[PDB]
Design a protein around this ligand. Structure first.
Ligand SMILES: [Ca+2]
Ligand SMILES: [Mg+2]
Ligand SMILES: [Mg+2]
Length: 430
DNA sequence: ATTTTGACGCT
DNA sequence: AGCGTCAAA
C-alpha cells in the first residue's frame, strides 16, 4: 500500500504522424489531398507494393503490403504516388527529410527519442512541472484540450463521436484536483495541454497531422496513441488501466506482438493483458526469463520504467535491396554492380549525415540472403569503414562476402543472392 | 514477390 | 562478433 510504487512518476507522450508517407506526397501534390490514395514502391510487379494508405482509402479496405492492382480491385478510384527510384532502387530520402522537419519541431518542446521515421517519444515531466508553476492553481479549460480523448470516459448515469469526446473530457476535468501540484492525473492533463500545443505547431509549420498518446510510460503512451486515430490524442491515466487491460489482447502491447506474446498466451492459457495480474513475479520469470517476467509483472499493472532516451538521430544508416524469384543475382558482376549502387546511395547519405550532424560512421555491415534460406538474413559480416567512398565500400563488402560463392565457376554465383544490405554503424563524433 | 528500413537482446 | 526478434513506412 504505502510502499507500492504505482508507475506515476513521469509524463510520457508518443507522437505518431498519420499515414505519414501519404501526407508527404499530399503536401507536395494537392491533387491527392482528401482523396483515397496510397504510396507504392515500384510498379512493374502487380502495380507495386503499397506501403502507406490514406484514411479515405482505408475505408475501402486498402492496406499496407497490398499490391496496387489488388487495392484497385477494392478501390477503383484509388490514387497512387510512387516512391522515387534512384540507382535502380527505391529511395526514401523525401520521407527522411520530412521526418527531420517534424522531429526538429518536437525537440523545441522537450527531449525526444526518435522511435521510427514518423514517431517520437517525449519526456514531458519537466515541462509539465514548469507549466504547473506558471498556471498558479488555475483550472484547466476544456478549450485547452480540443482534440483530447480521456480513455475510459464518459462512464456512469449524445450519439455523436465529438459529443462523447466532450462529455468524457468534461467528466475528467470536473473531477481533477488542481490544487495539488503532485497529483499524477493533473500532471497527465497538463502533459496533454502541451501535446496539443506541439501537435498544433507541427501542423502549422509542416502541414502534417498526427496523433498522440499521453500517459506515464512509453508502452501506455504508444497504446493510447492508437486508440483515437487520426488527428486526435488520447490520455490514458493510471486509473484507466484495469478496465482498459481487461479486454486488451496481449498482442496489442508493444514487444508482445510476436513470438513472446504468443508464448504468453499459449503457456498461461490467457488472452488479455489484465489476466497477467493473477501470476506472481516468480511464475512469470520461470516461464519467460528473469527480465521478461519482471517486465510483464509490472506492465500488466500499467507500470514500466524504460526511459525516453535522448536520441533524435538514427544510430545506423542502411541501404538494402531484395532480388525476388528469378531476379536473384547469379553472376559475380551482377553482385558487384548492385553492391556499387547500394554503396553510392550510402555514400551520399553518409556525407550528408557527416555535414549535418558532426559524426562519422566507423563500421560497415554487409548482410546477404541466399535463395531458399528460411531467414531474412542468411549471413552478416563487418569490416572497417574508413572512407566515405562508394567504390571502396562496395569493394570491401564484396571482399567480406566473396567467400559465400559455392560456384566452382569463376563468373557465376551460387546459390543466387536474394538480398543485399549495407549498413553504416558505430558512429563517432567528428 | 511487400520492400526498405531501424533498435535492441542473447550468447 | 553474429544471429534473432520486434517494429516502422
Ligand atoms: Ca504513423
Ligand atoms: Mg508510426
Ligand atoms: Mg502503421
Amino acid at each position: 500500500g504505502p510502499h507500492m510504487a504505482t508507475g506515476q512518476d513521469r509524463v510520457v507522450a508518443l507522437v505518431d504522424m498519420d499515414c505519414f508517407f501519404v501526407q508527404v506526397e499530399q503536401r507536395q501534390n494537392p491533387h491527392l489531398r482528401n482523396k483515397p490514395c496510397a504510396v507504392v514502391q515500384y510498379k512493374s510487379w502487380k502495380g507495386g507494393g503499397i506501403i502507406a494508405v490514406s484514411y479515405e482509402a482505408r475505408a475501402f479496405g486498402v492496406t499496407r503490403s497490398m499490391w496496387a492492382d489488388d487495392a484497385k480491385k477494392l478501390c477503383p478510384d484509388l490514387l497512387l504516388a510512387q516512391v522515387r527510384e534512384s540507382r535502380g532502387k527505391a529511395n526514401l530520402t523525401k520521407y527522411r527529410e520530412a521526418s527531420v522537419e517534424v522531429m526538429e519541431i518536437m525537440s523545441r518542446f522537450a527531449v525526444i527519442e526518435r522511435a521510427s521515421i514518423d514517431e517520437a517519444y517525449v519526456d514531458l515531466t519537466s515541462a509539465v512541472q514548469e507549466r504547473l508553476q506558471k498556471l498558479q492553481g488555475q483550472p484547466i479549460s476544456a478549450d485547452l484540450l480540443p482534440s483530447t480523448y480521456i480513455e475510459g470516459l464518459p462512464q456512469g448515469p449524445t450519439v455523436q463521436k465529438e459529443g462523447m469526446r466532450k462529455q468524457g473530457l468534461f467528466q475528467w476535468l470536473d473531477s481533477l484536483q488542481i490544487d495539488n501540484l503532485t497529483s499524477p492525473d493533473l500532471q497527465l492533463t497538463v502533459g496533454a495541454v502541451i501535446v496539443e500545443e506541439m501537435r498544433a505547431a507541427i501542423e502549422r509549420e509542416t502541414g502534417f497531422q498526427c496523433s498522440a498518446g499521453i500517459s506515464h510510460n512509453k508502452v501506455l503512451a504508444k497504446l493510447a496513441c492508437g486508440l483515437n486515430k487520426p488527428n486526435r490524442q488520447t490520455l490514458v491515466s493510471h486509473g484507466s488501466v484495469p478496465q482498459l487491460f481487461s479486454q486488451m489482447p496481449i498482442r496489442k502491447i508493444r514487444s508482445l506482438g510476436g513470438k513472446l506474446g504468443a508464448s504468453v498466451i499459449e503457456i498461461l492459457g490467457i488472452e488479455y493483458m489484465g489476466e497477467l495480474t493473477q501470476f506472481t513475479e516468480s511464475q512469470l520469470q520461470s516461464h519467460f526469463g528473469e527480465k521478461n517476467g519482471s517486465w510483464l509483472y509490472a506492465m500488466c499493472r500499467g507500470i514500466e520504467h524504460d526511459p525516453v532516451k535522448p536520441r533524435q538521430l538514427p544510430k545506423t544508416i542502411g541501404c538494402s535491396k531484395n532480388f525476388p524469384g528469378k531476379t536473384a543475382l547469379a553472376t559475380r558482376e551482377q553482385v558487384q554492380w548492385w553492391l556499387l549502387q547500394l554503396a553510392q546511395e550510402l555514400e551520399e547519405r553518409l556525407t550528408k549525415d557527416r555535414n549535418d550532424n558532426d559524426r562519422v560512421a566507423t563500421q560497415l555491415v554487409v548482410s546477404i540472403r541466399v535463395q531458399g534460406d528460411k531467414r531474412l538474413s542468411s549471413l552478416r559480416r563487418c569490416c572497417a569503414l574508413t572512407r566515405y567512398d562508394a567504390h571502396k565500400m562496395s569493394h570491401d563488402a564484396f571482399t567480406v562476402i566473396k567467400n559465400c560463392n559455392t560456384s566452382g565457376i569463376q563468373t557465376e554465383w551460387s546459390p543466387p543472392l536474394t538480398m543485399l544490405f549495407l549498413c553504416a554503424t558505430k558512429f563517432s563524433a567528428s
